[PDB]
Amino acid sequence: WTATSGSCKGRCFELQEVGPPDCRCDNLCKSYSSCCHDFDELCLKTARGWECTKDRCGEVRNEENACHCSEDCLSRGDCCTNYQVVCKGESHWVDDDCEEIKVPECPAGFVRPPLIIFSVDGFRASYMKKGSKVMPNIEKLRSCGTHAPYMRPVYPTKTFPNLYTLATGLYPESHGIVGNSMYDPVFDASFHLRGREKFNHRWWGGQPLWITATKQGVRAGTFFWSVSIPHERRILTILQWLSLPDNERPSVYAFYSEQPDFSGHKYGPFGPEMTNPLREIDKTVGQLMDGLKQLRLHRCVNVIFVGDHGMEDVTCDRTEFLSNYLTNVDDITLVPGTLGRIRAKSINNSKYDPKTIIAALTCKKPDQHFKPYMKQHLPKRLHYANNRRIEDIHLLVDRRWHVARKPLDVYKKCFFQGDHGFDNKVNSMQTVFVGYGPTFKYRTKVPPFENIELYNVMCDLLGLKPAPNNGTHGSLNHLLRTNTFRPTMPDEVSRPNYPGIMYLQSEFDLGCTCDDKVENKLEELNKRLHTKGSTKERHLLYGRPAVLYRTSYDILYHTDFESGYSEIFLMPLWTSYTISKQAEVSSIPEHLTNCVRPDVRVSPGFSQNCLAYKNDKQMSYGFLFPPYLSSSPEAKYDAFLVTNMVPMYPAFKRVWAYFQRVLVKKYASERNGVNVISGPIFDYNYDGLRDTEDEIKQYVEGSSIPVPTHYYSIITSCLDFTQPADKCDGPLSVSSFILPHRPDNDESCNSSEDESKWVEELMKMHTARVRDIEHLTGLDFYRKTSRSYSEILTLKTYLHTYES
Ligand SMILES: *[C@@H]1O[C@H](CO)[C@@H](O[C@@H]2O[C@H](CO)[C@@H](O[C@@H]3O[C@H](CO[C@H]4O[C@H](CO)[C@@H](O)[C@H](O[C@H]5O[C@H](CO)[C@@H](O)[C@H](O)[C@@H]5O[C@H]5O[C@H](CO)[C@@H](O)[C@H](O)[C@@H]5O)[C@@H]4O)[C@@H](O)[C@H](O[C@H]4O[C@H](CO)[C@@H](O)[C@H](O)[C@@H]4O[C@H]4O[C@H](CO)[C@@H](O)[C@H](O)[C@@H]4O)[C@@H]3O)[C@H](O)[C@H]2NC(C)=O)[C@H](O)[C@H]1NC(C)=O
Ligand SMILES: O=C(/C=C/c1ccc(OC(F)(F)F)cc1)N1CC[C@@H]2CN(C(=O)[C@@H]3CCc4[nH]nnc4C3)C[C@@H]2CC1
Ligand SMILES: [Ca+2]
Ligand code: NA
Ligand SMILES: [Zn+2]
C-alpha cells in the first residue's frame, strides 16, 4: 500500500530513499507504482519541448515549461541544453576542436572531478566504426579521449548480469545475478525481468559502485531510471543535480539508455531501422555535453560511455527443440533462448537422471547448434558454475541460434531479428568503452579488456577503495593520465627446497622399469652443472613462479626444463621450458616406450609409483615436459623421471600428446620460440580457486596420487617476433589454456577423427587468461621481467580469443 496523497512539491527526483507507505518522487517511483499523485504534473513537465528557439530567448520564466530559456535559467540550473547556443551565440560542444585536458578545470567548490557513466544497452562494438558517420558526439568522445576497439562482456551476455558486473567488478556467479530469469532453490523463489521479486535485496550480492561511494562519504546520484521517463528529462535531472550546493551535490552519476537494444531485437544488429536509434543516442550525448559546457563542466567531468553487450542476428527459424532429442521432455524445466539451463520439473520425480539427459543431447545431429555441459565442465574462462542459481546442466548455444523445449513455445507463447546471451568471446556480443575527461588519457587507443575491470577504475576516478572484486587492480592503469593505483607484487609464502642427490636406486620400490642402464669427466661435469641449474636462464625466462600459499615443494633442474615439484600432491605445480624456432621434434625411441625412472633427489615416500597406474584400469599417465622435445638422446632420459609424470585418462592423452608433439613446435615456428609453463589444476568444487588437499574427490586407484580436474599451459613469446622468445627486449605476447581432464572426448563431436581435425578447436574453446590460472593454482607468474608491473598485470588479464 502507498498513501499516494502526499506531494512531490519541491521533491522532484529527490535522492533520499523514502519508505512505505509515504509516496515517492524518485527516478524509480514509476516502476514501483509508488509516485505521489502530482509527480507527472510537477516532475515530468513536457510543455514546449526540450529545445530553446530564438523567440524564447529572454522569455519570462514560466514554471510549466519542460526547460527554460529565461535569463535566470543558468542560476536556477534548468536551461534547455541548447540555451547558450541559441540565445547566447555559443557553439555546440561537438563543433569545438578537441583540446587536451591536461588538468581539471572545475568551478569553485568542486572537491573532485565528477564521474558520469553513460550506459547503453545492446550497443555492439562495431557500431563505433560502422555508425560513426551518424554519431558525431560519440565519435568526438572516442577520438579525443581514451577508447578500446571493444570491451568484453561477462557470460551470459544478458542485460542484468552485465550491468551488475559493471557496477560490482564481480562475475555473475559471485554477484548472484546469473540470468535475467532465475530460480533460487534455497529461497524457493523465482526472479523475473518483470514483477516484484527482483526488488528483494537478497538477490543482489557484492557491493555496487553507488554503495561503495556512499559508505566512503562520496555522494551518488540515483543510477536507475523508469522506462517512461524520457531521455531528455534524465539528462536535465543530472544537470540539475550538478547545480546543487556543494554539500548536497553528488559526485557520481549514471544515465541509462534502452536503445539500441530495443530496436536491435526487432530489426537485427544492422537492420536499416538501426540508423535512427544511433542518431537519437548521439543527440542525447550532445545534450549532455552541451549542458556540461553551460555549467563550465565540460573540462572537469570524467565521462564513461559504456555498453553492456552486443547483438547478433537471430530468427525463429533458427531454433533447436529439445523435443527432437529427449523422450521425456515434460519431465524437465528449460530456461530457453541464447543459452539453456535445465533442471528437473518436479523434485519428487525419482526417475530424473542428468546423465541420461546429457547423453541424449550429445552429438545427436550432424549440424547440431548447441552443446550440453555439466556446469563444472564449461570453459573455465566463463566463470559460470559456483552459484546454486546456475542449474547443473547447461547448453552452450551457437551464435545466431536459440534453443527451446517444444515448437509450441516459439509460436504459441517471426517476432524478432536480434538477440544476445551467447559465449562472451563471440564477436557479435562485444560492446563499447570510451573514457573522456581530465583523468583519462588524450587521443589514446587501449587494447580490448573485460568489463570486470571497470569497477576498480571507477573507484580510482572517485578516490574510493574498491570492495573485493574480480578485476586485477592496476591492469587498466594505462587508460589513466593520473589517479593510477600502484600495486605491489604479492609476497611469496612458501620457499622451495633445492634437493641434491640423496637416494640410491634400490631404495625405490615403485614397480617402474626403464631400459636406461647404458653408458667420462668431460660430459659428467656438464650433466652435474645442468642438475644444479646451469641451463635455468634459458628455460625459466621470467623468474620462478611464486607459491602464494603454505606448502612443501622442491625446485628440480634439468637440461631441458625446470619444475617446482609438490611433495604434497606428488607432482609438479609447474614445469617450465623454452623451445626455440630451430628446435627439432623427435620420437620416443622403441626401447623407452614404457620407461619411468626414479628421481634420486626425491624420496620414495614423496614419489608416484607405476603399480598404481597398472592397477587403475581407467587411468594412464603423461609427462609435463614432453619427451618429443628433448634437446638430445641423453637429455631425453630426464623427461621419463617419475617427478615429470602426471595422471591422465587415455582419452585425454590423445589431446595432450598432440599438443606436445605437434602444436608446441608449430607455435615455436610461428612465434619465433616459445616459453611454456605447464601444470595440473585441482578444482573439484568448481569455485575457480585452487583446491586444498581435503577437497580432492578422486585419486589414482589405491594411492594418494590426486587426479587433476584440468591441465594448463601458459605460452609466452616476444611481442616483436623478430626477436626470439629467449632474447626479448620489450613487451611480451601470451596465450594460455585450461583443458578439462576428462575421461572421454564427448565434448568434441569429431573426436573419432585424427587429432589434426579436432584437438586445436578444443584448446581454443578452453583459452584462458594467466590470471585464471593464478586463481586456480595459487601461483604468481612473471615475477622477474624488465617490464613495469602494471604492464605485466595487463598481460596476465589478456585472453587470446581466436575470433578474426
Ligand atoms: C571473485 O571475487 C570475489 C570477491 O572477492 C570472490 O568471492 C569471495 O570468495 C571467498 C572464498 O570463496 C569468500 O569468502 C568466504 O566468506 C564467507 C562469509 O561470506 C559472507 O560474507 C561476505 C562479506 O560481506 C559476503 O560477500 C558473502 O556473500 C556471498 O553470499 C551471499 C549468499 O548468502 C550472496 O548474496 C553473495 O552474492 C555471495 O555469494 C557468493 O559467494 C558465496 C561464498 O561466500 C557462494 O556460496 C555463492 O555461490 C556466491 O558465489 C557472504 O554473505 C566465510 O564464511 C567463508 O569462510 C569459510 O571458509 C574459511 C576457510 O578460510 C573458514 O575460516 C570458515 O570455517 C568457513 O567455513 C565454514 O563454512 C563452510 C561452508 O558452509 C563449512 O563447510 C565449514 O564447515 C565452515 O562452517 C569464506 O571466507 C567470499 O564470500 C567471496 N565474496 C563474494 C562477494 O562472493 C571470488 O572468489 C572471486 N572469484 C575468482 C574466480 O577469483
Ligand atoms: O536505469 C537502468 C540502469 C542504469 C545503470 C547505470 C549504470 C550502470 O553501470 C554502472 F553501475 F557501472 F554504473 C548500470 C546500470 N535500468 C536498467 C536496470 C533496471 C533496474 N530496475 C529496477 O527496478 C532495480 C531492480 C533491482 C533493485 N533493487 N533495489 N532497487 C532496485 C531497482 C529496472 C531497470 C531500470 C532501468
Ligand atoms: Ca576449488
Ligand atoms: Na567425441
Ligand atoms: Zn536485449
PDB file of all heavy atoms in Angstrom, residues 682-692 695 776, ligand 3:
ATOM      1  N   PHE A 682      43.517 -28.407  -9.715  1.00  0.00           N
ATOM      2  CA  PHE A 682      42.529 -29.235  -8.950  1.00  0.00           C
ATOM      3  C   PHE A 682      41.428 -28.251  -8.564  1.00  0.00           C
ATOM      4  O   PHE A 682      41.647 -27.339  -7.765  1.00  0.00           O
ATOM      5  CB  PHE A 682      43.193 -29.852  -7.702  1.00  0.00           C
ATOM      6  CG  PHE A 682      44.382 -30.709  -8.023  1.00  0.00           C
ATOM      7  CD1 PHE A 682      45.665 -30.132  -8.132  1.00  0.00           C
ATOM      8  CD2 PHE A 682      44.239 -32.100  -8.209  1.00  0.00           C
ATOM      9  CE1 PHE A 682      46.747 -30.914  -8.449  1.00  0.00           C
ATOM     10  CE2 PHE A 682      45.342 -32.889  -8.533  1.00  0.00           C
ATOM     11  CZ  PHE A 682      46.603 -32.281  -8.630  1.00  0.00           C
ATOM     12  N   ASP A 683      40.241 -28.393  -9.154  1.00  0.00           N
ATOM     13  CA  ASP A 683      39.130 -27.516  -8.779  1.00  0.00           C
ATOM     14  C   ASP A 683      37.834 -28.349  -8.682  1.00  0.00           C
ATOM     15  O   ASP A 683      36.895 -28.201  -9.509  1.00  0.00           O
ATOM     16  CB  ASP A 683      38.946 -26.356  -9.785  1.00  0.00           C
ATOM     17  CG  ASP A 683      37.975 -25.270  -9.254  1.00  0.00           C
ATOM     18  OD1 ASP A 683      37.725 -25.255  -7.993  1.00  0.00           O
ATOM     19  OD2 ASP A 683      37.455 -24.462 -10.054  1.00  0.00           O
ATOM     20  N   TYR A 684      37.812 -29.265  -7.713  1.00  0.00           N
ATOM     21  CA  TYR A 684      36.655 -30.177  -7.594  1.00  0.00           C
ATOM     22  C   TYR A 684      35.376 -29.480  -7.138  1.00  0.00           C
ATOM     23  O   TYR A 684      34.321 -30.013  -7.410  1.00  0.00           O
ATOM     24  CB  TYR A 684      37.009 -31.306  -6.641  1.00  0.00           C
ATOM     25  CG  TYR A 684      37.784 -32.394  -7.336  1.00  0.00           C
ATOM     26  CD1 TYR A 684      39.171 -32.449  -7.256  1.00  0.00           C
ATOM     27  CD2 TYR A 684      37.113 -33.360  -8.129  1.00  0.00           C
ATOM     28  CE1 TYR A 684      39.874 -33.451  -7.915  1.00  0.00           C
ATOM     29  CE2 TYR A 684      37.818 -34.356  -8.788  1.00  0.00           C
ATOM     30  CZ  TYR A 684      39.199 -34.396  -8.660  1.00  0.00           C
ATOM     31  OH  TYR A 684      39.957 -35.375  -9.326  1.00  0.00           O
ATOM     32  N   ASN A 685      35.437 -28.329  -6.453  1.00  0.00           N
ATOM     33  CA  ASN A 685      34.200 -27.604  -6.050  1.00  0.00           C
ATOM     34  C   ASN A 685      33.896 -26.449  -6.990  1.00  0.00           C
ATOM     35  O   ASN A 685      33.064 -25.593  -6.690  1.00  0.00           O
ATOM     36  CB  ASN A 685      34.267 -27.093  -4.611  1.00  0.00           C
ATOM     37  CG  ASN A 685      35.437 -26.161  -4.390  1.00  0.00           C
ATOM     38  OD1 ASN A 685      36.255 -25.950  -5.293  1.00  0.00           O
ATOM     39  ND2 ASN A 685      35.536 -25.618  -3.199  1.00  0.00           N
ATOM     40  N   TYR A 686      34.559 -26.471  -8.151  1.00  0.00           N
ATOM     41  CA  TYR A 686      34.286 -25.528  -9.288  1.00  0.00           C
ATOM     42  C   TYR A 686      34.089 -24.083  -8.849  1.00  0.00           C
ATOM     43  O   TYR A 686      33.191 -23.382  -9.345  1.00  0.00           O
ATOM     44  CB  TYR A 686      33.168 -26.000 -10.248  1.00  0.00           C
ATOM     45  CG  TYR A 686      31.856 -26.430  -9.549  1.00  0.00           C
ATOM     46  CD1 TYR A 686      30.887 -25.489  -9.230  1.00  0.00           C
ATOM     47  CD2 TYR A 686      31.658 -27.775  -9.140  1.00  0.00           C
ATOM     48  CE1 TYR A 686      29.711 -25.860  -8.559  1.00  0.00           C
ATOM     49  CE2 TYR A 686      30.494 -28.151  -8.473  1.00  0.00           C
ATOM     50  CZ  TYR A 686      29.516 -27.180  -8.187  1.00  0.00           C
ATOM     51  OH  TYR A 686      28.317 -27.520  -7.538  1.00  0.00           O
ATOM     52  N   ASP A 687      34.970 -23.629  -7.954  1.00  0.00           N
ATOM     53  CA  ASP A 687      34.868 -22.240  -7.464  1.00  0.00           C
ATOM     54  C   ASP A 687      35.906 -21.355  -8.115  1.00  0.00           C
ATOM     55  O   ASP A 687      36.013 -20.216  -7.739  1.00  0.00           O
ATOM     56  CB  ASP A 687      34.928 -22.109  -5.930  1.00  0.00           C
ATOM     57  CG  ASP A 687      36.256 -22.571  -5.325  1.00  0.00           C
ATOM     58  OD1 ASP A 687      37.182 -23.017  -6.028  1.00  0.00           O
ATOM     59  OD2 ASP A 687      36.373 -22.485  -4.071  1.00  0.00           O
ATOM     60  N   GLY A 688      36.671 -21.890  -9.083  1.00  0.00           N
ATOM     61  CA  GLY A 688      37.704 -21.073  -9.774  1.00  0.00           C
ATOM     62  C   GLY A 688      38.985 -20.872  -8.940  1.00  0.00           C
ATOM     63  O   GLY A 688      39.939 -20.210  -9.398  1.00  0.00           O
ATOM     64  N   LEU A 689      39.042 -21.538  -7.782  1.00  0.00           N
ATOM     65  CA  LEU A 689      40.136 -21.385  -6.826  1.00  0.00           C
ATOM     66  C   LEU A 689      40.821 -22.705  -6.502  1.00  0.00           C
ATOM     67  O   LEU A 689      40.176 -23.737  -6.400  1.00  0.00           O
ATOM     68  CB  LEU A 689      39.590 -20.788  -5.511  1.00  0.00           C
ATOM     69  CG  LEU A 689      38.760 -19.481  -5.587  1.00  0.00           C
ATOM     70  CD1 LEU A 689      38.322 -19.079  -4.170  1.00  0.00           C
ATOM     71  CD2 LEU A 689      39.599 -18.356  -6.150  1.00  0.00           C
ATOM     72  N   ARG A 690      42.141 -22.654  -6.334  1.00  0.00           N
ATOM     73  CA  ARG A 690      42.960 -23.810  -6.001  1.00  0.00           C
ATOM     74  C   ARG A 690      42.342 -24.634  -4.886  1.00  0.00           C
ATOM     75  O   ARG A 690      42.029 -24.101  -3.809  1.00  0.00           O
ATOM     76  CB  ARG A 690      44.316 -23.267  -5.479  1.00  0.00           C
ATOM     77  CG  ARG A 690      45.276 -24.340  -4.967  1.00  0.00           C
ATOM     78  CD  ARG A 690      46.458 -23.745  -4.160  1.00  0.00           C
ATOM     79  NE  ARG A 690      46.047 -22.871  -3.048  1.00  0.00           N
ATOM     80  CZ  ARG A 690      45.870 -23.280  -1.774  1.00  0.00           C
ATOM     81  NH1 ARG A 690      46.095 -24.545  -1.413  1.00  0.00           N
ATOM     82  NH2 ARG A 690      45.459 -22.407  -0.855  1.00  0.00           N
ATOM     83  N   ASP A 691      42.178 -25.922  -5.112  1.00  0.00           N
ATOM     84  CA  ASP A 691      41.691 -26.809  -4.022  1.00  0.00           C
ATOM     85  C   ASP A 691      42.773 -27.071  -2.989  1.00  0.00           C
ATOM     86  O   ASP A 691      43.945 -27.233  -3.343  1.00  0.00           O
ATOM     87  CB  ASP A 691      41.296 -28.173  -4.591  1.00  0.00           C
ATOM     88  CG  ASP A 691      40.017 -28.157  -5.373  1.00  0.00           C
ATOM     89  OD1 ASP A 691      39.331 -27.104  -5.513  1.00  0.00           O
ATOM     90  OD2 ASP A 691      39.757 -29.245  -5.935  1.00  0.00           O
ATOM     91  N   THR A 692      42.365 -27.174  -1.717  1.00  0.00           N
ATOM     92  CA  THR A 692      43.206 -27.756  -0.685  1.00  0.00           C
ATOM     93  C   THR A 692      43.161 -29.290  -0.766  1.00  0.00           C
ATOM     94  O   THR A 692      42.294 -29.895  -1.397  1.00  0.00           O
ATOM     95  CB  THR A 692      42.744 -27.308   0.731  1.00  0.00           C
ATOM     96  OG1 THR A 692      41.342 -27.579   0.867  1.00  0.00           O
ATOM     97  CG2 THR A 692      42.923 -25.812   0.957  1.00  0.00           C
ATOM     98  N   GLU A 695      39.893 -31.368  -0.393  1.00  0.00           N
ATOM     99  CA  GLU A 695      38.805 -31.145  -1.367  1.00  0.00           C
ATOM    100  C   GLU A 695      38.864 -32.076  -2.558  1.00  0.00           C
ATOM    101  O   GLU A 695      37.948 -32.068  -3.352  1.00  0.00           O
ATOM    102  CB  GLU A 695      38.778 -29.652  -1.820  1.00  0.00           C
ATOM    103  CG  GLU A 695      38.219 -28.772  -0.702  1.00  0.00           C
ATOM    104  CD  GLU A 695      38.363 -27.262  -0.920  1.00  0.00           C
ATOM    105  OE1 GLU A 695      39.306 -26.811  -1.580  1.00  0.00           O
ATOM    106  OE2 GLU A 695      37.537 -26.516  -0.357  1.00  0.00           O
ATOM    107  N   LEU A 776      43.505 -20.528  -9.879  1.00  0.00           N
ATOM    108  CA  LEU A 776      43.306 -21.970  -9.799  1.00  0.00           C
ATOM    109  C   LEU A 776      44.480 -22.693  -9.203  1.00  0.00           C
ATOM    110  O   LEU A 776      44.334 -23.863  -8.855  1.00  0.00           O
ATOM    111  CB  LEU A 776      42.998 -22.603 -11.195  1.00  0.00           C
ATOM    112  CG  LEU A 776      41.577 -22.297 -11.645  1.00  0.00           C
ATOM    113  CD1 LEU A 776      41.441 -22.460 -13.164  1.00  0.00           C
ATOM    114  CD2 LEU A 776      40.571 -23.238 -10.967  1.00  0.00           C
TER     115      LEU A 776
HETATM  116 CA    CA B   3      38.403 -25.071  -5.746  1.00  0.00          CA
END
